[PDB]
Design an enzyme around this catalytic site. Structure first.
Site, PDB file in Angstrom:
ATOM      1  N   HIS A 102      41.825 -37.245  -7.690  1.00  0.00           N
ATOM      2  CA  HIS A 102      41.401 -36.400  -5.649  1.00  0.00           C
ATOM      3  C   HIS A 102      39.332 -35.853  -5.813  1.00  0.00           C
ATOM      4  O   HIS A 102      38.557 -36.415  -4.765  1.00  0.00           O
ATOM      5  CB  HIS A 102      41.855 -34.999  -4.903  1.00  0.00           C
ATOM      6  CG  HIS A 102      42.977 -35.799  -5.411  1.00  0.00           C
ATOM      7  ND1 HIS A 102      43.413 -36.623  -3.850  1.00  0.00           N
ATOM      8  CD2 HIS A 102      43.897 -34.874  -4.890  1.00  0.00           C
ATOM      9  CE1 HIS A 102      45.368 -36.673  -3.770  1.00  0.00           C
ATOM     10  NE2 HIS A 102      45.256 -36.061  -4.796  1.00  0.00           N
ATOM     11  N   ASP A 160      47.002 -42.871  -3.436  1.00  0.00           N
ATOM     12  CA  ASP A 160      46.196 -40.882  -3.378  1.00  0.00           C
ATOM     13  C   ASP A 160      44.322 -42.269  -3.291  1.00  0.00           C
ATOM     14  O   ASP A 160      43.641 -41.287  -2.374  1.00  0.00           O
ATOM     15  CB  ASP A 160      45.990 -40.189  -4.683  1.00  0.00           C
ATOM     16  CG  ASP A 160      47.150 -39.401  -4.596  1.00  0.00           C
ATOM     17  OD1 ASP A 160      47.940 -39.558  -3.443  1.00  0.00           O
ATOM     18  OD2 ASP A 160      47.687 -38.852  -5.419  1.00  0.00           O
TER      19      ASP A 160
HETATM   20  C1  LIG Z   1      60.422 -27.680 -13.285  1.00  0.00           C
HETATM   21  C2  LIG Z   1      61.468 -28.104 -14.224  1.00  0.00           C
HETATM   22  C3  LIG Z   1      61.091 -30.078 -12.554  1.00  0.00           C
HETATM   23  C4  LIG Z   1      61.154 -28.652 -10.630  1.00  0.00           C
HETATM   24  C5  LIG Z   1      60.060 -28.225 -10.349  1.00  0.00           C
HETATM   25  C6  LIG Z   1      59.347 -28.699  -9.410  1.00  0.00           C
HETATM   26  C7  LIG Z   1      57.929 -27.992  -9.228  1.00  0.00           C
HETATM   27  C8  LIG Z   1      57.367 -29.269  -8.680  1.00  0.00           C
HETATM   28  C9  LIG Z   1      56.194 -27.798  -8.567  1.00  0.00           C
HETATM   29  C10 LIG Z   1      54.663 -28.580  -8.016  1.00  0.00           C
HETATM   30  C11 LIG Z   1      54.552 -29.776  -7.824  1.00  0.00           C
HETATM   31  C12 LIG Z   1      52.715 -30.112  -7.065  1.00  0.00           C
HETATM   32  C13 LIG Z   1      52.969 -31.522  -7.466  1.00  0.00           C
HETATM   33  C14 LIG Z   1      50.866 -31.797  -7.300  1.00  0.00           C
HETATM   34  O1  LIG Z   1      50.482 -31.147  -7.323  1.00  0.00           O
HETATM   35  O2  LIG Z   1      50.199 -32.801  -8.325  1.00  0.00           O
HETATM   36  C15 LIG Z   1      49.292 -32.839  -8.015  1.00  0.00           C
HETATM   37  C16 LIG Z   1      49.104 -34.102  -7.578  1.00  0.00           C
HETATM   38  C17 LIG Z   1      49.067 -33.986  -5.864  1.00  0.00           C
HETATM   39  C18 LIG Z   1      49.004 -35.604  -5.127  1.00  0.00           C
HETATM   40  O3  LIG Z   1      50.318 -36.282  -5.728  1.00  0.00           O
HETATM   41  N1  LIG Z   1      48.244 -35.704  -4.379  1.00  0.00           N
HETATM   42  O4  LIG Z   1      47.921 -36.698  -3.385  1.00  0.00           O
HETATM   43  C19 LIG Z   1      47.465 -34.516  -7.545  1.00  0.00           C
HETATM   44  O5  LIG Z   1      47.260 -34.722  -8.921  1.00  0.00           O
HETATM   45  C20 LIG Z   1      46.829 -33.256  -9.298  1.00  0.00           C
HETATM   46  C21 LIG Z   1      46.597 -33.128 -11.087  1.00  0.00           C
HETATM   47  O6  LIG Z   1      45.175 -33.444 -10.954  1.00  0.00           O
HETATM   48  C22 LIG Z   1      48.288 -33.231  -9.830  1.00  0.00           C
HETATM   49  O7  LIG Z   1      49.049 -31.582 -10.370  1.00  0.00           O
HETATM   50 ZN   LIG Z   2      50.012 -37.920  -4.066  1.00  0.00          ZN
END
Ligand SMILES: CCCCCCCCCCCCCC(=O)O[C@@H]1[C@@H](CC(=O)NO)CO[C@H](CO)[C@H]1O
Ligand SMILES: [Zn+2]
Ligand SMILES: [Cl-]
Ligand SMILES: [Zn+2]
Ligand SMILES: [Zn+2]
EC number: 3.5.1.108
Length: 266
Positions: free
Chosen positions: A252, A229
């Site tokens: 980020h 990232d």
């Molecule tokens: C509930 C049981 C399991 C099955 C349901 C799964 C539900 C998934 C819901 C959506 C997940 C979104 C993941 C996300 O936004 O990760 C974020 C990450 C994003 C990233 O990688 N950016 O590059 C950046 O950092 C922040 C933290 O600061 C993370 O939160």
């Molecule tokens: Zn990411």
């Protein structure tokens, strides 16, 4: 390094992890000095920090009423392959998350590079610099090659881990997927995000469990992804970077803050 582009237009489609909407990317070849820019509904949005509009849970770029969510994974892959000139046509409001990592992006773009006629004008970290934010910290200093190290401290079983990327080790971080903690989810869902997240594009972690039946791809897949990232966010400097970076619990917002700083004084 020479500036690069793609031999031909590449297509990627799928749901965006936050919008839950289906979207499509079309990477179009561009000439020397063009740079990296996105294209949506008639507007061109430069992959530069001046256009960042959101840094919570993803890095979003916008301009003249047009926004594009989650540009970090494609940007990271582009930064790693040194693609310097391309237009990314976006049909939707977010880049497709695909499998959550940069593998599909990397594979395709890698086997389609086109060296051009110009020495890359690398952004070089001349003097040290540190940005902090209540516990979080990102230190950047001079270096001939790109060296990114992320050290995370997780409330869960992953405890404290750190991973280091150096040029040539691209394959070690392009497969590291997006991850989230079960406790984060209810929140992400509440604020209008993660609408397109599943166990197919996200690695869900509990206080002591890994929901994904497939498990982790590396014992430290999460920090590797944080490195991935950060390398994507770094590209917002406008050109391939060279410098030694160390992020402690970075994200980020802080990643973008470091870039804005590096931009100012250099
Ligand atoms: C509930 C049981 C399991 C099955 C349901 C799964 C539900 C998934 C819901 C959506 C997940 C979104 C993941 C996300 O936004 O990760 C974020 C990450 C994003 C990233 O990688 N950016 O590059 C950046 O950092 C922040 C933290 O600061 C993370 O939160
Ligand atoms: Zn990411
Ligand atoms: Cl938040
Ligand atoms: Zn060169
Ligand atoms: Zn949030």
């Amino acid at each position: 390094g020479l500036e690069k582009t793609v031999k031909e237009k590449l297509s990627f489609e799928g749901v965006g992890i936050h919008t839950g909407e289906y979207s499509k990317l079309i990477i179009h070849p561009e000439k020397e000095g063009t740079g990296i820019r996105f294209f949506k509904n008639g507007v061109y949005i430069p992959a530069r920090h001046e256009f960042v509009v959101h840094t919570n849970h993803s890095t979003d770029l916008g301009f003249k009423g047009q926004r594009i969510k989650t540009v970090e994974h494609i940007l990271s892959v582009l930064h790693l392959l040194e693609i310097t000139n391309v237009t990314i046509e976006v049909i939707g409001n977010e880049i497709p998350i695909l499998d959550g990592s940069g593998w599909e992006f990397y594979e395709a773009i890698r086997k389609n590079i086109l060296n051009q006629n110009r020495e890359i004008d690398y952004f070089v970290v001349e003097e040290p610099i540190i940005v902090e934010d209540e516990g979080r910290l990102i230190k950047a200093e001079p270096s001939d090659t790109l060296e990114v190290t992320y050290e995370g401290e997780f409330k869960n079983f992953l405890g404290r881990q750190k991973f280091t990327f150096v040029e040539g080790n691209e394959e070690e971080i392009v497969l590291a997927r997006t991850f989230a903690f079960d406790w984060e989810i209810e929140h992400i869902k509440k604020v209008g995000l993660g609408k397109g997240g599943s166990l197919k594009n996200t690695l869900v972690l509990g206080k002591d469990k890994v929901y994904n039946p497939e498990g982790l791809r590396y014992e430290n897949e999460p920090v590797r992804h944080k490195v991935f990232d950060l390398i994507g966010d770094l590209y917002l400097l406008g050109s391939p970077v060279k410098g030694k970076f160390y992020s402690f619990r970075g994200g980020h917002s802080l990643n973008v803050k470091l870039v804005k700083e590096l931009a100012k004084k250099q």
